[PDB]
Design a protein around this ligand. Structure first.
Ligand SMILES: Cc1ncc(C[n+]2csc(CCOP(=O)(O)OP(=O)(O)O)c2C)c(N)n1
Ligand SMILES: [Mg+2]
Ligand SMILES: [Mg+2]
Ligand SMILES: [Mg+2]
Ligand SMILES: [Mg+2]
Ligand SMILES: [Mg+2]
Ligand SMILES: [Mg+2]
Ligand SMILES: [Mg+2]
Lengths: 213, 213
């Protein structure tokens, strides 16, 4: 199953959205207005909403089929929350996160690092960060094949941690049994034939496919 | 001493720059043109310059005073190369990298993990990356004062690695003796004074100051 989570970021940085392929639509704070003004469903609405006018928060209030209202002073970001909740409703679903990039970078990182958290690690394989130019997936140790997304021009293996014994095949550039001692971002690989593959014994890796301006 | 480096990003997303403050100007690929079309100096030109026309690259070759033209096929990104060259010439200068804004997240993380590289570790305290919206500084374990940037609203402690004993004061949000078991982005913190402070025993943190669009 497919859930789309929409954060406050600007919708111009959004990926190509095809609503037929999403089953549940979550709004985070301003993503709610953003989903709505985009003529897209709004099933869940999450956050403190302290970035909206009363006239906007009522609009959201009247439309979402479910409003989770948080305090302003809490631990979790609105987004950790939306993910926690959407995962309750859809424990095996693919979480496509959106509007979480293109601006503040301390906020981008907080999103890039969501799989790191115990409550999410279990579903790192379903957590998916997207914007017009990038497309990020997560992987724990193992052996995988990565099918090329059509619109993306480049491939990258970003080790978010020290990685052990990393081998890449079926891609313009290779590593065999490479040790990655500190976070390294093997950055501008390219696909050779519709799919590449890699294996590694330890750490985490964000697989980023992307394309230019 | 300060050195200023310019990647090929759109200059629209540049920080406000004051040139008096820099003693050396470094162009990176298409950033070489951005410097000249902004009536600023170009003293070091670096890259493979494949993004440039034959005519633009003729203009960058007459104007610069040192040209480093490198193979399109290398391990290093143009920016990795330019940084090492420039530190070769100014080993104690504070490197400010702007225009690293192209939008590709493999390159974003390529840049953000620079200090990790054994050839840059010895100067992490010297490396800065800046955006219209963002300003990034690196820290190894110690005790520090973090002077507020006048145009910025937010403060963030982005732990690039598991951090240990993270104490953090004079902020609008505190941690104290905090163990951070994996990468964690404590973002959207605020200054209460003109300076904040923090300390830690192990790992590496990227202090980030940011503001809204
Ligand atoms: C393991 C393997 N991954 C893929 C890389 C691909 N490679 C390393 S960096 C990159 C060069 C890109 O440099 P550039 O984007 O001009 O620099 P920028 O100006 O954006 O700083 C090449 C393709 C290969 N060398 N090694
Ligand atoms: Mg379907
Ligand atoms: Mg909020
Ligand atoms: Mg409100
Ligand atoms: Mg280039
Ligand atoms: Mg080389
Ligand atoms: Mg202390
Ligand atoms: Mg301490």
């Amino acid at each position: 199953s497919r859930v789309l989570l929409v954060a406050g970021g600007n919708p111009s940085d959004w990926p190509t959205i095809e609503p037929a392929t999403y089953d549940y639509f979550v709004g985070i704070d301003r993503g709610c207005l953003h989903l709505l003004e985009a003529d897209l469903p709004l099933q869940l609405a999450v956050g403190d909403f302290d970035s909206l006018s009363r006239e906007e928060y009522h609009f959201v209030q009247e439309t979402t089929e479910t409003l989770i209202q948080a305090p302003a002073e809490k631990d979790d970001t609105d987004t950790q929350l939306a993910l926690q909740e959407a995962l309750q409703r859809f424990p095996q679903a693919e979480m496509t996160i959106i509007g979480a990039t293109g601006g503040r970078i301390d906020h981008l990182l907080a999103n890039l690092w969501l799989p790191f958290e115990p409550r999410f690690q279990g579903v790192l394989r379903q957590i998916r960060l997207c914007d017009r130019q990038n497309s990020i997936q997560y992987y724990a140790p193992g052996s995988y094949i990565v099918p090329k997304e059509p619109d993306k021009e480049y491939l990258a293996y970003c080790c978010l941690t020290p990685v052990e014994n990393l081998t890449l095949r079926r891609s313009k550039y290779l590593l065999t049994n490479q040790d990655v001692p500190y976070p390294t971002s093997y950055a501008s690989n390219e696909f050779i034939e519709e799919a590449a593959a890699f294996s590694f014994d330890a750490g985490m890796i964000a697989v980023i496919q992307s394309k230019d301006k």
